[PDB]
Amino acid sequence: AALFQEQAERSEKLRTESYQDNLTGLANRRYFEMQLNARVSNPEQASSGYLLLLRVKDLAGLNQRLGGQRTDELLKAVGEQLSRECAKYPETQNLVTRIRGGEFAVLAPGMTREEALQLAQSLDSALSSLYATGATDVAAVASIGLAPFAHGDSPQAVLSLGDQALAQAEGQGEQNWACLDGDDHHAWHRLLDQALNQRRFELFFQPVVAAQDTQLVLHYKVLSRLLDEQGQTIPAGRFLPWLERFGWTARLDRLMLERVLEQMAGHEESLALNLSSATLADPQALNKVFEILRAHSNLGARLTLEIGEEQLPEQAVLEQLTRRLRELGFSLSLQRFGGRFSMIGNLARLGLAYLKIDGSYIRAIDQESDKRLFIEAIQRAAHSIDLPLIAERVETEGELSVIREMGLYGVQGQLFGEPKPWG
């Protein structure tokens, strides 16, 4: 509709003005804090990783010697070099940010120490091109700091050692980057290859219930758990980066889908299951998926496939993708959605089942008006195309009462039950 188009635009303007750095087009400090806050807390996404901080050298002197305009161009050029170098690490998607003046930050969930050293050094070399270019007249260009973080670290503390790493880089008149002080890489490689071959991944399930009546179950989200040697389960937050590191995500998708379709035959409930970019990229993996769905036409009305917003293929592949699924009787949704409509585009025509809102916007939504205001704008656009919204990571009675007020369709999170075994 022209109505959708207009509502989506308001929504984008609000997203951009709220969460995007005007100058560079990167994310801003608020978005980075929201992400750091949330991305250090949930079991499904990587526990550990690295924070990278980057500080342009002598910003004030540059402004004085080169002028404000020439300095703004350098800042954008720095932002662009940072995007390029981080692109190699798909987990940094949407987490490349400009904090203050000449200070940038990137969060890299799951990144190993070896990878962080590689990024530091490749970024350093990249940025040196900005001196050769004359974009800056400081030969050193910028200071870089890397600091590790784990699940359960306070965001304040993570920023603090990011700052120490950065300060350590500075006291070295010599060397622009510093990394603060596997494994075991080989154990994960063998653990995972075997586990896949042996089908030793369990299905866990988390209820997704109606926001407007929490006793009513909408579907169960399926989550993958790895068994250890003692039949203990390991969370996806820990193993998934390794699978992606080894390039085995598509293997898990295939195993998970066959297993889910086997288990659905014994009951009448609806389920949802991830479909990774890994599966979507290899046409041979994709076709096995269609093959597998064709054989289970009967279950299509009960299974929704979910793609992460950060893993969306081209609108073209997306459009045909929803088309093939619809012919098989299976439905498609987005999860981790952050309102990037200029990236979905033809959304109105996809006939998606729902959009699940990234838990980062939901956390503390009863206490942070910018989040509440942004989700309301998304609900406005979605409402006009009859596309329901489902909030992820609802943990609090306060968050839930606000989601109700906003008239959203669904809610999921600790408040309603953790991922557990079952039917």
The token pair that represents 371 in the structure block: 């989040």
Resolution (A): 2.0
Q: Which residues pair with 349 in a beta bridge?
A: none
Is 190 assigned to a binding site? no
Is 253 assigned to a binding site? yes
Is 237 assigned to a binding site? yes
Cα gap 190→218, rounded to integer Å? 38
Statement: 182-423 belongs to CATH 3.20.20.450: yes
Is 88 assigned to a binding site? no
Is 35 assigned to a binding site? no
Is 45 assigned to a binding site? no
Return the C-alpha torsion angle 147, 148, 154, 156, nearest 10. 0
Indicate the helix (H) or strand (E) that contains 223: strand 213-227
Domain with CATH 3.20.20.450 in the chain: 182-423
Is 221 assigned to a binding site? yes
C-alpha pair distances (Å), 228 with each of 101, 201, 206, 244: 47, 9, 21, 19
Return the C-alpha torsion angle 122, 128, 130, 133, nearest 10. -130
Cα gap 242→259, rounded to integer Å? 21
Cα gap 315→416, rounded to integer Å? 34
Whether the CA torsion 68, 73, 76, 78 is positive or negative: it is negative
Is 336 assigned to a binding site? yes
Is 323 assigned to a binding site? no
Residue spans of alpha helices (H) in 198-233: none
Is 64 assigned to a binding site? no
Cα gap 423→421, rounded to integer Å? 7
Statement: 1-181 belongs to CATH 3.30.70.270: yes
Domain with CATH 3.30.70.270 in the chain: 1-181
Indicate the helix (H) or strand (E) that contains 60: helix 59-66
Is 270 assigned to a binding site? no
Whether the CA torsion 350, 352, 358, 361 is positive or negative: it is positive
Is 202 assigned to a binding site? no
Cα gap 255→373, rounded to integer Å? 40
CA atoms within 13 A on the CB side of 236: 18
